[PDB]
């Protein structure tokens, strides 16, 4: 067998994710409008939107209207994209998800629901909107 060790290598059409976490909608527009895949997963397995710093809706809408993964999530802890925007308080990204068919009814592994994790930390404005758009 060929010699090797620890990881190996891999690239993507995911700049939309790496740049998003860094607050870069221009790069997300480039990694996408340049002719790429709407699901360029990242080593963080945090979907293309779950890893956008949840501080710039400009990125949440970019991939959403394209084909991001607002319904899929991390199978290691059932972490959907609704919980990410909830732990931060970006109610804008929340509208985008539900504005393009989103799965607002999952639990972050053992966090009951995204609405609870919101008001739990310091996001009541988003928590109230979630319970009204997630269904008890």
From Swiss-Prot:
Pfam families xref list: Ank_2
Tell me which domain of life the UniProt entry assigns to the organism this sequence originates from. Answer: Eukaryota
| GO CC annotation | cytoplasm; nucleus
Q: What's a GO biological-process term for it?
A: negative regulation of G1/S transition of mitotic cell cycle
MF-aspect GO terms: cyclin-dependent protein serine/threonine kinase inhibitor activity; protein kinase binding
**Phosphothreonine modification, residue list:** 18
Q: Which UniProt keywords apply?
A: ANK repeat, Cell cycle, Phosphoprotein, Repeat, Tumor suppressor
Note the InterPro entries from the entry. Ank_Repeat/CDKN_Inhibitor, Ankyrin_rpt, Ankyrin_rpt-contain_sf
Q: Does the keyword Repeat apply?
A: yes
Q: Where would I find the ANK repeats?
A: 11-40, 44-72, 77-106, 110-136
What tissues contain this protein?
A: Expressed ubiquitously.
Outline the inducing conditions: By TGF-beta.
Q: What is the role of the protein in this entry?
A: Interacts strongly with CDK4 and CDK6. Potent inhibitor. Potential effector of TGF-beta induced cell cycle arrest.
What family is it from?
Belongs to the CDKN2 cyclin-dependent kinase inhibitor family.
Please identify the protein, giving its name as recorded.
Cyclin-dependent kinase 4 inhibitor B
The species this protein was found in = Mus musculus
Organism lineage string: Eukaryota, Metazoa, Chordata, Craniata, Vertebrata
């Amino acid at each position: 067998g060929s010699p090797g060790i620890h990881m190996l290598g891999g690239s993507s059409d995911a700049g939309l994710a790496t740049a998003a976490a860094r607050g870069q909608v221009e790069t997300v527009r480039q990694l996408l409008e340049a002719g790429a895949d709407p699901n360029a997963l990242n080593r963080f397995g945090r979907r293309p939107i779950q890893v956008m710093m949840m501080g710039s809706a400009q990125v949440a809408e970019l991939l959403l209207l394209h084909g991001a993964e607002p319904n899929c999530a991390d199978p290691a802890t059932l972490t959907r994209p609704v919980h990410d925007a909830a732990r931060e308080g970006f109610l804008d990204t929340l509208v985008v998800l539900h504005r393009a068919g989103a799965r607002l009814d999952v639990c972050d592994a053992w966090g009951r629901l995204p609405v609870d994790l919101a008001e739990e930390q310091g996001h009541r404005d988003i928590a109230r909107y979630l319970h009204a758009a997630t269904g008890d």
